[PDB]
């Protein structure tokens, strides 16, 4: 899976926005591939990191990090006020066929669009 | 919203399966809401637990899928291996609705991208 530009569509609350994000190499220290949006400022861009490990089981980790900028008085370069995170960690075992892993990935993907999660995440109301 | 039956369509490798799951109560000790499939055996049941904290709001979603196997010289099947999944959102106090919706949709759409469908199915680094 060679790194390449990823254009995510239908993103947003209204399902109208879309974002293009391009790779920025792999860290040799721990093999964590990184991708980010060309936001003209390195400190105020949305970034994604993906890394699959090696065994006694495999572990896939995906992190999403996007900051929110603000122009505070007394300075010219905008700083970072608040920062939104997201973490995902699959923990498949050695003897797991690809069908089971695909099932896990698909149910996780479709569970983030069901009426339960799109409500428990947007308004932070606990499920009862 | 209160817990209710959740049905998921176009699930699987080819998107030709459907997974229906129903609630299984709420644990009062730590406030996790559970859901599970009607698998007719409590041990071999795909389950999903969702829980939001109260202050740095934190949202945690945990998915457990065990797999069965015919025990040698026995009748009751045992859980040979389990597939795990975890999601942890960490929105702050002043975050608006648009930012959280954007993060959720990003995680939902990126997870079906050609990069992730190969990183997860084929276990090859990017």
């Amino acid at each position, epitope marked *: 899976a060679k790194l390449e530009t*990823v254009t995510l569509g239908n993103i947003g609350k209204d399902g109208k926005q879309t974002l293009v994000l391009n790779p920025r190499g792999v860290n040799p220290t721990n093999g964590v591939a990184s991708l980010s949006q060309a936001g003209a400022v390195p400190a105020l861009e949305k970034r994604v990191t993906v890394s699959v490990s090696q065994p006694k089981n495999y572990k896939v980790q995906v992190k999403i990090q996007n900051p929110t900028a603000c122009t505070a008085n007394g300075s010219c370069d905008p700083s970072v006020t608040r920062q939104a995170y997201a973490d995902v960690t699959f923990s498949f075992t050695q003897y797991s066929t690809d069908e089971e892993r695909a099932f896990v990935r698909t149910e996780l993907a479709a569970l983030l669009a069901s009426p339960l999660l799109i409500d428990a995440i947007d308004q932070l109301n606990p499920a009862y | 919203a209160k817990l209710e039956t959740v049905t998921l369509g176009n699930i699987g490798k080819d998107g030709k399966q459907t997974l229906v799951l129903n609630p299984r109560g709420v644990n009062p000790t730590n406030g996790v809401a559970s859901l599970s499939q009607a698998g007719a055996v409590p041990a071999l049941e795909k389950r999903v637990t969702v829980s939001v904290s109260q202050p740095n709001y934190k949202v945690q979603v945990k998915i457990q899928n065990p797999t069965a196997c015919t025990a040698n010289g026995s009748c009751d099947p045992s859980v040979t291996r389990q597939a795990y999944a975890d999601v942890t959102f960490s929105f702050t106090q002043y975050s608006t609705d648009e930012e959280r919706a954007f993060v959720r949709t990003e995680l939902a759409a990126l997870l079906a991208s050609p990069l992730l469908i190969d990183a997860i199915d084929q276990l090859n680094p990017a």
Partner: antibody, heavy 113, light 106 residues
Framework: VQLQQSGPELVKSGTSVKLSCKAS????????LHWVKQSHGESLEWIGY????????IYNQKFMGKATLTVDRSSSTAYMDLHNLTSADSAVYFC???????????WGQGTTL | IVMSQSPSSLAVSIGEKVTLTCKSS????????????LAWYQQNPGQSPKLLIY???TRESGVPDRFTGSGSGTDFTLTISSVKAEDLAIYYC????????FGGGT
């Protein structure tokens, strides 16, 4: 979000023109303000936009010479000029807005030339 | 990109299940995930047009259920579910990635 203002400009000859689009209710932080032209008849074709995150000076080909898209961020208005007016000035020039790469959400009424 | 659409005029009067066909000269699966990039606009002869469908299969808020569409790699269609007294006039189609380009007629 709504956007309006126009003016039935009826000036002749190729001296100059100044069309404007006073957009309100939205900020230029991510959105793009397109300038689709309808001509007269069939098939209105795009004329460019202004995206701060994409450059803000993307112009359609075969329209580079007679187009100039300058946007003032103080009052949140976008206006353009056409240098030469011989036969391109035919009919309405719509003013458009939308997301960064999304569809065109809402269009205000256009000037008549 | 060029968007060649079905001939300018139709002949349906009332109630008939009439479909609008659009054909592109290039693949429109620009998005990394399989999402098309078409939008269908209808323009009355008097004022500015309105958006009807984006992603070629998703309706826009505040639009009646008649308008539905299906999308393939490059051969898309718009299937209005019967026509009422005022559902006429030009039905433009547009791809809206990188350089947009309209095209078509009634």
């Amino acid at each position: 979000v709504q956007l309006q203002q126009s003016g039935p400009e009826l000036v002749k000859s190729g001296t100059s023109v100044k069309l404007s689009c006073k957009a309100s209710g939205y900020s230029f932080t991510d959105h793009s303000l397109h300038w689709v032209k309808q001509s007269h008849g069939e098939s209105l074709e795009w004329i460019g936009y202004f995206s701060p995150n994409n450059g803000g000076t993307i112009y359609n080909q075969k329209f580079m010479g007679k187009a100039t898209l300058t946007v003032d961020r103080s009052s949140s208005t976008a206006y353009m000029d056409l240098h030469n007016l011989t036969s391109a000035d035919s009919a309405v020039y719509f003013c458009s807005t939308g997301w960064d790469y999304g569809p065109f959400d809402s269009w205000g009424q256009g000037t008549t030339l | 990109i060029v968007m060649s659409q079905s001939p300018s005029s139709l002949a349906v009067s009332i109630g008939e299940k009439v479909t609008l066909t659009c054909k592109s000269s290039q693949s429109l699966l620009f998005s990394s995930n399989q999402k098309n990039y078409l939008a269908w606009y209808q323009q009355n002869p008097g004022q500015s047009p309105k958006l009807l469908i984006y992603w070629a299969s998703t309706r826009e808020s505040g639009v009646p259920d008649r308008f539905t569409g299906s999308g393939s790699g490059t051969d898309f269609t718009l299937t209005i579910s019967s026509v009422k007294a005022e559902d006429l006039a030009i039905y433009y189609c547009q791809q809206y990635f990188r350089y947009p380009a309209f095209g078509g007629g009634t």
